[PDB]
Amino acid sequence: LDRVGVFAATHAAVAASDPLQARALVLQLPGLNRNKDVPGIVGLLREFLPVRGLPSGWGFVEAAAAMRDIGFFLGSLKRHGHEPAEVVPGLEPVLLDLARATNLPPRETLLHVTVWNPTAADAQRSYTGLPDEAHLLESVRISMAALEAAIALTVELFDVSLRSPEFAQRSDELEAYLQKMVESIVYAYRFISPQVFYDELRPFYEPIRVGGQSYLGPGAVEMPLFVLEHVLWGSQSDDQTYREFKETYLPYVLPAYRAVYARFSGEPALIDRALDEARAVGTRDEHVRAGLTALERVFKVLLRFRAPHLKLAERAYEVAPSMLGELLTLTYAARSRVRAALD
Ligand code: HEM
Ligand SMILES: N[C@H](Cc1c[nH]c2c(Cl)cccc12)C(=O)O
């Protein structure tokens, strides 16, 4: 999976940045959360919160790293029943400035807490310090860079003719990158206690209010998989619930993925174009048969992520949102279209 390298290196740039010199301070947050010490949590944040304004030399990297370190306090304060912007003076203007500097929402996202978060024991930021949280973060680190590579490959595949042997080849490569999502779920199912997730981790992921609206807490739901699938199969879907789902999470993904999304909203999806071409040319063409077959395997790997993921989520929530089952159904229907072309 040679394409992963560059994405992982960009993540590592943010992970290596500590512009507020906050590492040793943020590591004390788990203890304070365990003690439910709200004044203490506010006090610890005020030790490094740049209430006077952001240093002028900062770029995206520093601002994202700053949002990461302040971010864990945001989830923590809400977990104890407090709007962070209401209990921390001068916090809201800092959060809005960091949002400006990153073109991201004014709170921590999945990216901040996982790939932009250093991995070492003496550096990794966490809400709880629990081994289950460490496993949860690792599960996302397994597949994020591969997913970003997969988005790039999907956009490239879009302009590849089914009549070309490249279609089958690019589809096979895409499947290999998407396999990492399956590995993530396997890991999460093996290593994360459902009870510890539901009782101890879940409380830290509530929404907070900043700038007169609500921003969702970090979650793997924020992974730009929905952008990949928008391009792949979903862009022209008439399912209103599905459209609402994608529009909900769009703000939380990187600006480049929001632009990819907008680019393809007014186009037929890859699947639609590929099926139209297969039907136009005939299935007697060997490159058409091979292209569709390889494309079917892309849907197979998506289902091998999505179906086990539903079980993972239902197991935790038995200690799950209907959105999950509905999306699974949509994905089966998409694969069925491909199977029907080959039949
Ligand atoms: C114990 C671990 C996990 C639990 C309890 C869980 C729970 C959920 C829930 C309840 C949803 C529905 C949206 C929401 O209400 O937040 C969701 C969506 C989603 N989750 Fe997870 N999740 C877990 C692990 C993971 C992992 C490890 C990944 C991938 C690395 C992942 C990827 C996704 C994605 C991409 C969605 C959007 C819906 C979809 O594509 O099917 N989740 N998750
Ligand atoms: N809300 C679920 C579970 C979740 C909450 N927070 C999470 C992190 Cl920080 C990483 C993975 C999963 C995760 C999801 O969105 O997948």
Short mmCIF file of C-alpha atoms and ligand atoms in Angstrom, two decimals:
data_model
loop_
_atom_site.label_atom_id
_atom_site.label_comp_id
_atom_site.label_asym_id
_atom_site.label_seq_id
_atom_site.Cartn_x
_atom_site.Cartn_y
_atom_site.Cartn_z
CA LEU A 1 0.00 0.00 0.00
CA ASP A 2 2.67 2.48 -1.14
CA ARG A 3 0.30 5.49 -1.35
CA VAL A 4 -0.27 5.54 2.44
CA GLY A 5 3.17 7.04 3.16
CA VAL A 6 2.48 10.64 2.14
CA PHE A 7 -0.84 10.83 4.07
CA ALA A 8 0.73 9.32 7.21
CA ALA A 9 3.62 11.83 6.93
CA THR A 10 1.19 14.77 6.80
CA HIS A 11 -0.56 13.38 9.94
CA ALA A 12 2.77 13.00 11.71
CA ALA A 13 3.55 16.71 11.14
CA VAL A 14 0.58 17.68 13.37
CA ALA A 15 1.28 14.86 15.85
CA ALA A 16 4.86 16.16 16.33
CA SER A 17 3.71 19.75 16.98
CA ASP A 18 3.23 21.04 20.55
CA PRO A 19 2.95 24.83 20.01
CA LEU A 20 1.42 25.52 23.45
CA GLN A 21 4.06 23.35 25.18
CA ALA A 22 1.10 21.50 26.67
CA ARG A 23 2.10 17.78 26.58
CA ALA A 24 2.84 17.37 30.32
CA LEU A 25 -0.28 19.37 31.23
CA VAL A 26 -2.78 17.49 29.03
CA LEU A 27 -1.47 14.16 30.42
CA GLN A 28 -2.90 15.23 33.82
CA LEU A 29 -6.45 15.45 32.39
CA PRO A 30 -7.38 11.72 32.87
CA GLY A 31 -6.67 11.95 36.64
CA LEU A 32 -8.90 15.04 36.93
CA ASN A 33 -11.68 13.37 34.93
CA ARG A 34 -11.48 10.33 37.23
CA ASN A 35 -11.85 12.72 40.20
CA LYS A 36 -14.66 14.61 38.38
CA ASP A 37 -12.78 17.78 39.34
CA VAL A 38 -14.39 20.47 37.17
CA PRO A 39 -12.66 23.55 38.69
CA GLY A 40 -9.39 21.60 38.38
CA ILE A 41 -10.05 20.85 34.69
CA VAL A 42 -10.71 24.57 33.99
CA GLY A 43 -7.58 25.47 36.02
CA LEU A 44 -5.40 23.06 34.03
CA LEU A 45 -6.68 24.44 30.70
CA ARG A 46 -5.99 28.05 31.82
CA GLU A 47 -2.32 27.10 32.36
CA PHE A 48 -1.82 26.91 28.57
CA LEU A 49 -4.88 28.51 26.88
CA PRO A 50 -3.71 31.46 24.69
CA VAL A 51 -6.46 33.86 25.84
CA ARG A 52 -4.48 36.87 24.51
CA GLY A 53 -4.58 35.62 20.90
CA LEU A 54 -2.75 33.23 18.56
CA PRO A 55 0.99 33.64 17.76
CA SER A 56 1.33 35.28 14.32
CA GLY A 57 3.91 32.74 13.03
CA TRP A 58 1.48 29.77 13.29
CA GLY A 59 0.30 27.84 10.23
CA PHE A 60 -2.30 25.08 9.83
CA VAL A 61 -0.05 22.61 11.68
CA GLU A 62 0.31 24.67 14.87
CA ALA A 63 -3.36 25.73 14.94
CA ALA A 64 -4.57 22.09 14.47
CA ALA A 65 -2.17 20.90 17.20
CA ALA A 66 -3.46 23.69 19.47
CA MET A 67 -7.09 22.66 18.77
CA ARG A 68 -6.13 19.06 19.68
CA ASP A 69 -4.73 20.00 23.11
CA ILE A 70 -7.50 22.43 24.08
CA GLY A 71 -9.98 19.95 22.52
CA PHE A 72 -9.68 17.18 25.09
CA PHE A 73 -10.83 19.71 27.73
CA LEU A 74 -13.94 20.51 25.66
CA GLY A 75 -15.20 16.90 25.61
CA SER A 76 -14.22 16.56 29.28
CA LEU A 77 -16.13 19.62 30.52
CA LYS A 78 -19.27 18.59 28.60
CA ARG A 79 -18.94 15.02 29.99
CA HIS A 80 -19.34 16.51 33.51
CA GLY A 81 -22.42 18.49 32.39
CA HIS A 82 -20.87 21.87 31.50
CA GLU A 83 -20.75 23.90 28.30
CA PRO A 84 -17.02 24.63 28.02
CA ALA A 85 -17.66 28.07 26.49
CA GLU A 86 -19.79 28.97 29.54
CA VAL A 87 -17.25 28.00 32.21
CA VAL A 88 -13.92 29.01 30.61
CA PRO A 89 -13.51 32.76 30.12
CA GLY A 90 -11.90 33.75 26.81
CA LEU A 91 -12.23 30.21 25.41
CA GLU A 92 -14.81 30.85 22.69
CA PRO A 93 -12.75 33.55 20.85
CA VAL A 94 -9.69 31.22 20.84
CA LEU A 95 -11.81 28.33 19.43
CA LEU A 96 -13.26 30.57 16.68
CA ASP A 97 -9.73 31.81 15.76
CA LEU A 98 -8.42 28.24 15.52
CA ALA A 99 -11.43 27.26 13.39
CA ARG A 100 -10.52 30.21 11.10
CA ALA A 101 -6.89 29.08 10.90
CA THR A 102 -7.74 25.44 10.09
CA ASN A 103 -10.97 25.83 8.04
CA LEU A 104 -12.44 23.21 10.41
CA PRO A 105 -15.13 23.41 13.16
CA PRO A 106 -14.33 25.25 16.45
CA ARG A 107 -13.74 22.08 18.54
CA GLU A 108 -11.82 18.78 18.43
CA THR A 109 -12.66 16.28 15.67
CA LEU A 110 -11.72 12.66 14.95
CA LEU A 111 -8.53 13.86 13.20
CA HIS A 112 -7.30 15.81 16.25
CA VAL A 113 -7.75 12.89 18.67
CA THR A 114 -6.40 10.10 16.41
CA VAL A 115 -3.97 10.73 13.53
CA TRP A 116 -2.93 14.19 14.73
CA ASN A 117 -2.34 12.88 18.27
CA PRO A 118 1.15 11.48 19.06
CA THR A 119 1.26 7.75 19.76
CA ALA A 120 3.85 7.48 22.56
CA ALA A 121 2.80 6.77 26.17
CA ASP A 122 4.50 9.95 27.42
CA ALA A 123 2.78 12.09 24.71
CA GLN A 124 -0.60 10.63 23.66
CA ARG A 125 -3.53 12.87 24.69
CA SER A 126 -6.64 11.12 26.01
CA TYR A 127 -9.91 11.85 27.83
CA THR A 128 -9.68 8.85 30.20
CA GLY A 129 -6.23 7.28 30.01
CA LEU A 130 -7.99 3.90 29.74
CA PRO A 131 -6.46 1.09 27.64
CA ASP A 132 -9.81 0.77 25.79
CA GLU A 133 -9.54 4.41 24.64
CA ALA A 134 -5.96 3.75 23.46
CA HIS A 135 -7.32 0.78 21.46
CA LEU A 136 -10.15 2.93 20.07
CA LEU A 137 -7.63 5.52 18.80
CA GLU A 138 -5.42 2.79 17.31
CA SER A 139 -8.40 1.29 15.42
CA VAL A 140 -8.78 4.58 13.52
CA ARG A 141 -5.03 5.01 12.96
CA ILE A 142 -5.03 1.57 11.23
CA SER A 143 -7.14 2.82 8.29
CA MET A 144 -7.28 6.65 8.07
CA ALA A 145 -4.25 7.13 5.74
CA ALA A 146 -5.41 4.19 3.58
CA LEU A 147 -8.90 5.72 3.36
CA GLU A 148 -7.43 9.06 2.21
CA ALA A 149 -5.46 7.19 -0.45
CA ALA A 150 -8.70 5.37 -1.38
CA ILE A 151 -10.53 8.70 -1.89
CA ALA A 152 -7.78 9.80 -4.31
CA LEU A 153 -7.99 6.45 -6.18
CA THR A 154 -11.81 6.70 -6.41
CA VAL A 155 -11.66 10.20 -7.93
CA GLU A 156 -9.04 8.91 -10.41
CA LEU A 157 -11.14 5.83 -11.27
CA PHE A 158 -14.14 8.08 -12.05
CA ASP A 159 -12.50 9.24 -15.31
CA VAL A 160 -11.27 5.77 -16.32
CA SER A 161 -13.16 3.97 -19.09
CA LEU A 162 -14.57 0.51 -18.31
CA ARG A 163 -13.25 -0.55 -21.76
CA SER A 164 -9.69 0.10 -20.50
CA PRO A 165 -7.77 -2.66 -18.61
CA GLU A 166 -6.86 0.15 -16.18
CA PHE A 167 -10.41 0.07 -14.77
CA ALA A 168 -10.06 -3.48 -13.42
CA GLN A 169 -6.50 -2.73 -12.20
CA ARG A 170 -7.44 0.52 -10.40
CA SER A 171 -10.52 -1.19 -8.87
CA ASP A 172 -8.36 -4.03 -7.50
CA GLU A 173 -5.98 -1.46 -5.99
CA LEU A 174 -8.90 0.46 -4.43
CA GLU A 175 -10.20 -2.73 -2.83
CA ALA A 176 -6.76 -3.33 -1.23
CA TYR A 177 -6.82 0.10 0.43
CA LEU A 178 -10.43 -0.32 1.60
CA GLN A 179 -9.42 -3.63 3.24
CA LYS A 180 -7.87 -1.50 6.03
CA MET A 181 -11.39 -0.46 7.17
CA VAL A 182 -12.12 -4.17 7.71
CA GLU A 183 -8.91 -4.53 9.75
CA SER A 184 -9.99 -1.54 11.90
CA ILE A 185 -13.29 -3.21 12.88
CA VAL A 186 -11.61 -6.57 13.57
CA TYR A 187 -9.19 -4.74 15.89
CA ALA A 188 -11.95 -2.78 17.64
CA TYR A 189 -14.04 -5.93 18.17
CA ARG A 190 -11.06 -7.79 19.67
CA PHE A 191 -9.55 -5.07 21.84
CA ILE A 192 -12.31 -2.69 23.02
CA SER A 193 -14.64 -3.64 25.89
CA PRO A 194 -18.27 -2.80 24.91
CA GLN A 195 -19.08 -1.97 28.55
CA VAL A 196 -16.05 0.32 28.95
CA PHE A 197 -16.91 2.04 25.67
CA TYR A 198 -20.57 2.61 26.56
CA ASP A 199 -20.11 3.50 30.23
CA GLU A 200 -16.73 5.24 30.25
CA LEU A 201 -15.82 6.54 26.76
CA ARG A 202 -19.16 7.45 25.11
CA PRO A 203 -19.91 10.22 27.74
CA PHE A 204 -16.93 12.24 26.43
CA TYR A 205 -18.32 12.57 22.85
CA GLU A 206 -21.37 14.82 23.43
CA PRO A 207 -22.03 17.99 21.37
CA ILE A 208 -20.98 21.45 22.60
CA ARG A 209 -22.25 24.92 21.69
CA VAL A 210 -19.83 27.41 20.11
CA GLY A 211 -20.77 30.52 18.12
CA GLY A 212 -24.51 29.97 18.49
CA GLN A 213 -24.67 26.44 17.08
CA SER A 214 -24.02 22.83 18.17
CA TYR A 215 -20.92 20.89 17.13
CA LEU A 216 -20.80 17.10 17.37
CA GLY A 217 -18.13 15.30 19.37
CA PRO A 218 -15.35 13.25 17.81
CA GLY A 219 -16.28 9.90 16.28
CA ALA A 220 -15.19 7.56 13.48
CA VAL A 221 -18.46 8.60 11.82
CA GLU A 222 -16.39 11.70 10.84
CA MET A 223 -14.05 9.59 8.65
CA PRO A 224 -14.44 10.78 5.03
CA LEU A 225 -15.70 7.32 3.93
CA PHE A 226 -19.05 8.99 3.13
CA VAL A 227 -17.23 11.30 0.68
CA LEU A 228 -15.60 8.32 -1.05
CA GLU A 229 -19.00 6.62 -1.34
CA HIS A 230 -20.68 9.85 -2.50
CA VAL A 231 -18.34 9.69 -5.53
CA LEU A 232 -18.54 5.89 -5.84
CA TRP A 233 -22.32 5.27 -5.65
CA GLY A 234 -24.32 7.79 -3.61
CA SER A 235 -24.12 11.22 -5.28
CA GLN A 236 -27.46 10.92 -7.13
CA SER A 237 -29.33 8.99 -4.42
CA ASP A 238 -32.89 10.22 -3.79
CA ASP A 239 -32.78 8.91 -0.19
CA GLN A 240 -33.37 12.03 1.93
CA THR A 241 -32.21 10.44 5.21
CA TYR A 242 -28.93 9.45 3.50
CA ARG A 243 -28.46 12.97 2.09
CA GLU A 244 -29.07 14.45 5.57
CA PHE A 245 -26.47 12.06 7.05
CA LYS A 246 -23.75 13.21 4.59
CA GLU A 247 -24.59 16.93 4.97
CA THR A 248 -24.42 16.53 8.77
CA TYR A 249 -20.81 15.29 8.77
CA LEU A 250 -19.48 17.28 5.82
CA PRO A 251 -18.21 20.20 8.02
CA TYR A 252 -16.00 17.83 10.06
CA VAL A 253 -13.90 16.50 7.16
CA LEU A 254 -10.85 18.18 5.59
CA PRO A 255 -11.55 21.13 3.23
CA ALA A 256 -10.21 19.08 0.29
CA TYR A 257 -12.87 16.40 0.92
CA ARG A 258 -15.65 18.98 1.21
CA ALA A 259 -14.54 20.25 -2.24
CA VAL A 260 -14.50 16.70 -3.64
CA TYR A 261 -18.05 16.30 -2.29
CA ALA A 262 -19.29 19.54 -3.94
CA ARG A 263 -17.58 18.62 -7.23
CA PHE A 264 -19.55 15.36 -7.51
CA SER A 265 -22.96 16.41 -6.11
CA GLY A 266 -24.15 17.45 -9.61
CA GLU A 267 -22.65 14.46 -11.42
CA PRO A 268 -23.84 10.87 -11.79
CA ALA A 269 -21.93 8.58 -9.43
CA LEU A 270 -19.11 6.32 -10.65
CA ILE A 271 -21.39 3.25 -10.49
CA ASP A 272 -24.05 4.99 -12.65
CA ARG A 273 -21.50 5.90 -15.34
CA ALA A 274 -19.82 2.47 -15.23
CA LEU A 275 -23.16 0.61 -15.57
CA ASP A 276 -24.26 2.95 -18.39
CA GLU A 277 -21.02 2.19 -20.21
CA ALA A 278 -21.24 -1.59 -19.63
CA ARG A 279 -24.79 -1.56 -21.02
CA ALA A 280 -23.75 0.56 -24.03
CA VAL A 281 -20.72 -1.57 -25.07
CA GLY A 282 -21.87 -5.12 -24.16
CA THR A 283 -20.64 -7.69 -21.65
CA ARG A 284 -18.86 -9.64 -24.43
CA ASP A 285 -16.03 -7.08 -24.11
CA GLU A 286 -13.48 -8.71 -21.77
CA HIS A 287 -12.43 -5.41 -20.17
CA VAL A 288 -16.09 -4.68 -19.38
CA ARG A 289 -16.54 -8.10 -17.70
CA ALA A 290 -13.27 -7.68 -15.74
CA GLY A 291 -14.01 -4.06 -14.78
CA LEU A 292 -17.43 -4.88 -13.36
CA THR A 293 -16.05 -7.93 -11.52
CA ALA A 294 -13.32 -5.85 -9.88
CA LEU A 295 -15.92 -3.16 -9.09
CA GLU A 296 -18.11 -5.79 -7.38
CA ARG A 297 -15.16 -6.68 -5.10
CA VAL A 298 -15.00 -3.00 -4.06
CA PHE A 299 -18.61 -3.31 -2.85
CA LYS A 300 -17.76 -6.64 -1.19
CA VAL A 301 -15.03 -5.01 0.95
CA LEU A 302 -17.37 -2.11 1.84
CA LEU A 303 -19.92 -4.66 3.11
CA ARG A 304 -17.20 -6.53 5.02
CA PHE A 305 -16.55 -3.28 6.88
CA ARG A 306 -20.19 -2.22 7.22
CA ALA A 307 -21.90 -5.45 8.39
CA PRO A 308 -19.35 -6.31 11.18
CA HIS A 309 -19.36 -2.63 12.17
CA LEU A 310 -23.13 -2.82 12.79
CA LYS A 311 -22.53 -5.79 15.15
CA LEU A 312 -19.73 -3.87 16.92
CA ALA A 313 -22.05 -0.88 17.44
CA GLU A 314 -25.09 -2.93 18.49
CA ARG A 315 -22.94 -4.87 21.00
CA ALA A 316 -21.82 -1.56 22.57
CA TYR A 317 -25.30 -0.01 22.56
CA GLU A 318 -26.86 -3.14 24.11
CA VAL A 319 -24.92 -2.12 27.27
CA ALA A 320 -27.61 1.31 17.81
CA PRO A 321 -28.83 4.28 15.68
CA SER A 322 -31.10 3.23 12.77
CA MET A 323 -28.84 5.17 10.36
CA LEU A 324 -26.42 2.20 10.37
CA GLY A 325 -28.92 -0.43 9.16
CA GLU A 326 -30.28 1.96 6.52
CA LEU A 327 -26.84 2.61 5.05
CA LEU A 328 -26.06 -1.12 5.02
CA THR A 329 -29.24 -1.71 2.98
CA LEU A 330 -28.20 1.03 0.50
CA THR A 331 -24.78 -0.64 0.07
CA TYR A 332 -26.30 -4.10 -0.61
CA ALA A 333 -28.59 -2.46 -3.19
CA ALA A 334 -25.56 -0.82 -4.83
CA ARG A 335 -23.68 -4.15 -5.08
CA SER A 336 -26.86 -5.80 -6.44
CA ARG A 337 -26.81 -3.36 -9.38
CA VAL A 338 -23.25 -4.49 -10.23
CA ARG A 339 -24.17 -8.20 -9.85
CA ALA A 340 -27.22 -7.67 -12.11
CA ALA A 341 -25.02 -6.15 -14.86
CA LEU A 342 -22.78 -9.25 -14.81
CA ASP A 343 -25.90 -11.46 -14.86
C1 HEM B 1 -16.70 0.24 19.95
C2 HEM B 1 -16.38 0.85 18.81
C3 HEM B 1 -17.40 1.60 17.93
C4 HEM B 1 -18.66 1.96 18.22
C5 HEM B 1 -19.44 1.72 19.53
C6 HEM B 1 -19.21 2.64 17.06
C7 HEM B 1 -20.47 3.17 16.95
C8 HEM B 1 -21.00 3.82 15.86
C9 HEM B 1 -22.33 4.39 15.76
C10 HEM B 1 -23.40 4.34 16.87
C11 HEM B 1 -22.45 4.93 14.55
C12 HEM B 1 -23.70 5.66 14.00
C13 HEM B 1 -23.39 7.16 14.07
C14 HEM B 1 -23.39 7.74 15.47
O1 HEM B 1 -24.46 7.79 16.13
O2 HEM B 1 -22.30 8.17 15.95
C15 HEM B 1 -21.21 4.74 13.83
C16 HEM B 1 -20.94 5.16 12.54
C17 HEM B 1 -19.77 5.00 11.84
N1 HEM B 1 -18.62 4.37 12.32
FE1 HEM B 1 -18.43 3.46 14.21
N2 HEM B 1 -18.24 2.67 16.08
C18 HEM B 1 -17.12 2.05 16.58
C19 HEM B 1 -15.94 1.87 15.90
C20 HEM B 1 -15.67 2.29 14.62
C21 HEM B 1 -14.42 2.09 13.92
C22 HEM B 1 -13.19 1.38 14.52
C23 HEM B 1 -14.53 2.63 12.70
C24 HEM B 1 -13.47 2.68 11.57
C25 HEM B 1 -12.16 2.77 11.82
C26 HEM B 1 -15.86 3.18 12.59
C27 HEM B 1 -16.36 3.82 11.49
C28 HEM B 1 -17.61 4.36 11.36
C29 HEM B 1 -18.08 5.02 10.16
C30 HEM B 1 -17.31 5.25 8.85
C31 HEM B 1 -19.52 5.44 10.48
C32 HEM B 1 -20.47 6.18 9.52
C33 HEM B 1 -21.50 5.13 9.04
C34 HEM B 1 -21.04 4.07 8.04
O3 HEM B 1 -20.18 4.33 7.16
O4 HEM B 1 -21.57 2.92 8.10
N3 HEM B 1 -16.53 2.96 13.78
N4 HEM B 1 -20.34 4.06 14.66
N1 LIG B 2 -19.72 7.45 17.68
C1 LIG B 2 -19.08 6.22 17.17
C2 LIG B 2 -18.04 5.67 18.17
C3 LIG B 2 -16.87 6.61 18.48
C4 LIG B 2 -16.92 7.68 19.26
N2 LIG B 2 -15.72 8.26 19.33
C5 LIG B 2 -14.87 7.56 18.59
C6 LIG B 2 -13.51 7.73 18.33
CL1 LIG B 2 -12.71 9.08 19.06
C7 LIG B 2 -12.84 6.83 17.50
C8 LIG B 2 -13.54 5.76 16.93
C9 LIG B 2 -14.90 5.58 17.20
C10 LIG B 2 -15.56 6.49 18.03
C11 LIG B 2 -18.44 6.47 15.81
O1 LIG B 2 -18.48 7.58 15.30
O2 LIG B 2 -17.88 5.55 15.20
#
